[PDB]
Amino acid sequence: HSHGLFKKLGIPGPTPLPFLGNILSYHKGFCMFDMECHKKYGKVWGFYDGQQPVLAITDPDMIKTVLVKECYSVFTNRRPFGPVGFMKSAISIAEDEEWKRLRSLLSPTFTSGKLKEMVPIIAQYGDVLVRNLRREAETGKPVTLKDVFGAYSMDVITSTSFGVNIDSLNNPQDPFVENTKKFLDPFFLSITVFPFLIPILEVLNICVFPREVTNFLRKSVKRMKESRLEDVDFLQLMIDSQNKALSDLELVAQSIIFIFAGYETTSSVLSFIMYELATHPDVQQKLQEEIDAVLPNKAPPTYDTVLQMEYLDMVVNETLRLFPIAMRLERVCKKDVEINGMFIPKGVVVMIPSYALHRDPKYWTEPEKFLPERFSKKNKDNIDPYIYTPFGSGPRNCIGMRFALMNMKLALIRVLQNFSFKPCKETQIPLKLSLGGLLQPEKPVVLKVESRD
Amino acid sequence: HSHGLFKKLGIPGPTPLPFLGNILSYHKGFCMFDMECHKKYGKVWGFYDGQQPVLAITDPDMIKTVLVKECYSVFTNRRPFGPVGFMKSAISIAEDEEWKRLRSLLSPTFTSGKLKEMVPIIAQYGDVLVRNLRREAETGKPVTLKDVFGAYSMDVITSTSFGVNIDSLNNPQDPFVENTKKFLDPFFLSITVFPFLIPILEVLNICVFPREVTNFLRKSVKRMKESRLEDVDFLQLMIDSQNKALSDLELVAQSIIFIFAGYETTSSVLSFIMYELATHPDVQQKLQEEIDAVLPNKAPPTYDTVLQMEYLDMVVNETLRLFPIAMRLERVCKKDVEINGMFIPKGVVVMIPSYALHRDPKYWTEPEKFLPERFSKKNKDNIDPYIYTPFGSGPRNCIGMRFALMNMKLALIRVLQNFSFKPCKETQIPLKLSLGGLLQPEKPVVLKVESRD
Numbered sequence: 049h050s051h052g053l054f055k056k057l058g059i060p061g062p063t064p065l066p067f068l069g070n071i072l073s074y075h076k077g078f079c080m081f082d083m084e085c086h087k088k089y090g091k092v093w094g095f096y097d098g099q100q101p102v103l104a105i106t107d108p109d110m111i112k113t114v115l116v117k118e119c120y121s122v123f124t125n126r127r128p129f130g131p132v133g134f135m136k137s138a139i140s141i142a143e144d145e146e147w148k149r150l151r152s153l154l155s156p157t158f159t160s161g162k163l164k165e166m167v168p169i170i171a172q173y174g175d176v177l178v179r180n181l182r183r184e185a186e187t188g189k190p191v192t193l194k195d196v197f198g199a200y201s202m203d204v205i206t207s208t209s210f211g212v213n214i215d216s217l218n219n220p221q222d223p224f225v226e227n228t229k230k231f232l233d234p235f236f237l238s239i240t241v242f243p244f245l246i247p248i249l250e251v252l253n254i255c256v257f258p259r260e261v262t263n264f265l266r267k268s269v270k271r272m273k274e275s276r277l278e279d280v281d282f283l284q285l286m287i288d289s290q291n292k293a294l295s296d297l298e299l300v301a302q303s304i305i306f307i308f309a310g311y312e313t314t315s316s317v318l319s320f321i322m323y324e325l326a327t328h329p330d331v332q333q334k335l336q337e338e339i340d341a342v343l344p345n346k347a348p349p350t351y352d353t354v355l356q357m358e359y360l361d362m363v364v365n366e367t368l369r370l371f372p373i374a375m376r377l378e379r380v381c382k383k384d385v386e387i388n389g390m391f392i393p394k395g396v397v398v399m400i401p402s403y404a405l406h407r408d409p410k411y412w413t414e415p416e417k418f419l420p421e422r423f424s425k426k427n428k429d430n431i432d433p434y435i436y437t438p439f440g441s442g443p444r445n446c447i448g449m450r451f452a453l454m455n456m457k458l459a460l461i462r463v464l465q466n467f468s469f470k471p472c473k474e475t476q477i478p479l480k481l482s483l484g485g486l487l488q489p490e491k492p493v494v495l496k497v498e499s500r501d
Numbered sequence: 502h503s504h505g506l507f508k509k510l511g512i513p514g515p516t517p518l519p520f521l522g523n524i525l526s527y528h529k530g531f532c533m534f535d536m537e538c539h540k541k542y543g544k545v546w547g548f549y550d551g552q553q554p555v556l557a558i559t560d561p562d563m564i565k566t567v568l569v570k571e572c573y574s575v576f577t578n579r580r581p582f583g584p585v586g587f588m589k590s591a592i593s594i595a596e597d598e599e600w601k602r603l604r605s606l607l608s609p610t611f612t613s614g615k616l617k618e619m620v621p622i623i624a625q626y627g628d629v630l631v632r633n634l635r636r637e638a639e640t641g642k643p644v645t646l647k648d649v650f651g652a653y654s655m656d657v658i659t660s661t662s663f664g665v666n667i668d669s670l671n672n673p674q675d676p677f678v679e680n681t682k683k684f685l686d687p688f689f690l691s692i693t694v695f696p697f698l699i700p701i702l703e704v705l706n707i708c709v710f711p712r713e714v715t716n717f718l719r720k721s722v723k724r725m726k727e728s729r730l731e732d733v734d735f736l737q738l739m740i741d742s743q744n745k746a747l748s749d750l751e752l753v754a755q756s757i758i759f760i761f762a763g764y765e766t767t768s769s770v771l772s773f774i775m776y777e778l779a780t781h782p783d784v785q786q787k788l789q790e791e792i793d794a795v796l797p798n799k800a801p802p803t804y805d806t807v808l809q810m811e812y813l814d815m816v817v818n819e820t821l822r823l824f825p826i827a828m829r830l831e832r833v834c835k836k837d838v839e840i841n842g843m844f845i846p847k848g849v850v851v852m853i854p855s856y857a858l859h860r861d862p863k864y865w866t867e868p869e870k871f872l873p874e875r876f877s878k879k880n881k882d883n884i885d886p887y888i889y890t891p892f893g894s895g896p897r898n899c900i901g902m903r904f905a906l907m908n909m910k911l912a913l914i915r916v917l918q919n920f921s922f923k924p925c926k927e928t929q930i931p932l933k934l935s936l937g938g939l940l941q942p943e944k945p946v947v948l949k950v951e952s953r954d
């Protein structure tokens with residue numbers, strides 16, 4: 049019974065129930081619980097996910113010590129989340145020196161050099177997206193953005209990770225699209241209250257990643273890794289490092305994590321962005337004019353062109369402030385240490401509430417408002433990089449940050465070049481967030497899509 | 502399923518059954534299984550305790566790298582054996598830097614200086630032992646040595662660990678003697694086949710150490726730690742270091758481990774020694790003459806006197822060669838490494854079969870024989886310290902080695918000064934070892950005890 053740890057350390061927080069801890073407070077949701085605790089407890093507080101002690105920190109210097117300074121020494125890993133199977137070799141799931149071998153093996157794939165090589169392949173589906181949009185624009189019926197963006201996010205993934213070129217919106221039957229289309233609480237709740245059952249689920253071959261999908265994928269790599277190019281994508285870039293090096297099953301696990309990390313992240317954020325532009329027409333028009341100025345006469349976007357649109361980058365950053373889809377950052381304290389004046393005992397999970405810090409008035413003026421001008425080159429300097437942490441920070445931040453930014457902007461440039469977006473009767477205004485544990489709209493975003501000539 | 506690990510590494514061993522591994526081979530016993538594998542497989546082999554891979558090594562240089570050279574870096578911990586409770590803080594059970602804090606905190610207690618201070622207290626019960634022996638010597642009926650030695654081993658423990666002076670043979674009702682009097686397979690078998698159930702047993706407060714005993718002890722320390730000497734033993738020596746330092750519950754756990762490590766180890770070996778001397782009268786008389794020469798006219802043994810009897814030390818060492826009560830040494834490989842030419846992957850338990858190496862003809866002539874002359878100052882030089890490992894080796898060897906040697910010899914000097922030991926009709930000749938997992942006689946040792954005048 050570790051429930052006295054925080055009152056023994058003199059750390060405030062909600063009183064834990066036996067076995068359950070504080071998990072019943074998640075009824076309002078992950079983020080609201082972080083916001084309430086931040087308001088009534090202060091800069092540091094603790095709570096129990098079952099019997100697991102979780103210390104929340106909000107001091108920008110302390111966050112830097114955890115995420116950057118003492119990353120390799122103490123705060124190296126995340127906490128386990130369930131029976132993982134062979135996916136223990138995924139970089140996002142690996143720990144300690146095993147992870148350090150993968151982060152080093154996989155860093156050159158996300159170079160700005162390899163990123164520019166992927167733009168033409170993913171720009172091909174920016175045209176595929178706009179084409180699937182012209183039909184629903186003449187259809188005259190509102191559009192569920194998560195379906196078109198999800199198809200686009202899928203079409204970019206398969207081409208960038210395997211070269212497989214599909215119109216997943218128009219080819220919902222390709223065996224490569226069904227499996228890839230495959231959170232919630234009815235399981236992962238019990239995992240946190242019963243983490244002593246994770247070792248049981250492992251020996252039963254029960255995995256959080258379905259056995260239906262993974263078998264198709266390790267064997268669909270089995271054909272296309274060798275027997276296909278045995279005569280620029282994420283797969284080809286990792287193979288070149290095999291020839292301390294990556295294994296076969298290791299390489300499969302890393303590619304599976306890229307699809308998971310790319311599909312319902314790109315499309316979720318892109319759906320959030322279009323909701324903001326439709327409900328803020330001043331911003332959508334101002335962006336459409338910057339898009340038209342840099343790219344005159346519906347010109348195609350390039351690598352260097354995207355990194356030039358400042359208002360586009362300002363719209364992306366501010367949407368990520370309101371909606372950091374990761375919600376929290378977490379590190380497991382590997383040993384007794386003392387960071388910036390307080391003692392963290394071994395085993396305690398240190399947590400940075402990204403969603404709560406993104407909406408704290410201590411740093412944000414009118415936090416509920418969508419105001420891209422906070423990221424103007426005048427005011428971007430006044431933003432603490434350890435308060436605004438949409439991609440994390442330190443040696444274990446989001447490795448696909450620059451890919452995600454480029455992929456999302458290339459979709460927005462093409463989409464806003466040809467269309468305008470307006471709210472409908474079905475448009476949830478104000479948008480309500482999911483009550484679960486996924487930073488998604490409560491009800492899917494539906495907007496009117498008008499064609500620009 | 503890690504059952505292919507050793508045939509993937511090209512390492513020989515018995516083929517594992519699903520789930521069970523090689524545990525069914527323990528029917529002949531722990532040591533016989535090690536002896537057979539050593540004979541038919543060679544210097545290195547592997548086997549599975551359920552799903553846990555265990556690599557056995559017999560190369561003296563490789564054993565030094567595991568036990569000494571790469572102890573702190575890689576081979577630091579032992580493997581978990583069951584639900585342990587608060588006894589996770591015991592030095593023998595602690596891991597990594599937590600153990601290093603305890604081994605450093607507890608090393609000064611086992612100084613030769615503190616050891617000489619304990620001789621008068623434990624010599625007091627060497628007289629208590631001889632007194633309980635004179636009655637059974639005039640009784641004329643054979644003596645179960647494990648009862649008298651167990652009582653003596655208990656009377657030394659309570660006085661050296663708490664100052665409690667009891668005649669546990671004559672006071673079997675003292676509340677301090679019953680609890681301390683409290684392996685086998687019907688549980689620890691399933692723990693190795695179901696190690697995924699250890700986390701379950703922990704949350705159920707189910708502990709390998711009974712809740713009946715520990716509560717009496719943490720609270721019997723609660724009175725005598727403070728409320729008794731609040732106005733030389735293992736307890737007083739640890740308290741002086743509290744006043745990074747030892748905690749209250751930590752101090753209780755270390756004292757509990759000393760009783761466990763001292764009771765059925767001292768008395769078990771002492772029972773083995775008296776069996777050897779009774780069935781080898783040439784050695785018993787030669788020792789009784791050395792005991793009489795150094796200590797003329799039944800003189801009391803002292804610290805410096807004990808370290809002077811060479812044949813006594815030779816009898817103790819050779820009995821420990823035939824019966825290393827630990828049977829094996831073990832270390833958990835903390836990370837992928839390469840020791841003396843072969844690759845050990847992370848998680849593999851490295852095992853040194855002490856019992857098998859103590860009876861290997863590659864280093865031992867007539868290994869089944871009791872021949873104390875192997876440890877003569879002429880031939881002691883030809884004994885590899887990494888073959889003969891009764892107390893382990895390296896930074897995590899037996900911390901109470903010099904205490905155990907002094908405590909056993911002080912019993913033998915007094916006992917052989919007053920008595921002689923001869924086999925009976927009940928004396929199991931040849932002595933059969935336990936078929937279980939405890940290096941003990943199959944049937945308890947019973948010998949005729951004659952009084953010397």
Ligand code: HEM
Nearest residue numbers: 139140309310313374438439440441444445446447448452
């Ligand atoms: C809008 C898009 C995305 C957002 C907001 C996002 C956010 C994040 C965050 C907050 C983390 C945790 C960082 C930390 O703990 O300090 C993370 C980790 C990670 N992300 Fe992303 N991500 C996005 C897209 C992607 C994409 C497209 C990929 C790959 C193609 C990717 C791959 C990863 C990986 C592998 C990790 C784990 C890194 C490690 O543990 O070494 N992410 N992401």
Ligand code: HEM
Nearest residue numbers: 592593762763766827891892893894897898899900901905
């Ligand atoms: C004939 C008597 C004894 C024998 C043969 C013996 C043997 C051993 C062996 C083989 C080990 C493992 C060493 C290794 O893994 O390298 C060990 C560990 C240990 N022994 Fe003993 N022992 C004896 C008596 C004692 C006594 C009397 C005490 C304390 C009063 C004691 C305390 C310990 C402790 C604490 C450890 C664990 C050390 C650590 O993990 O840091 N032993 N013993």
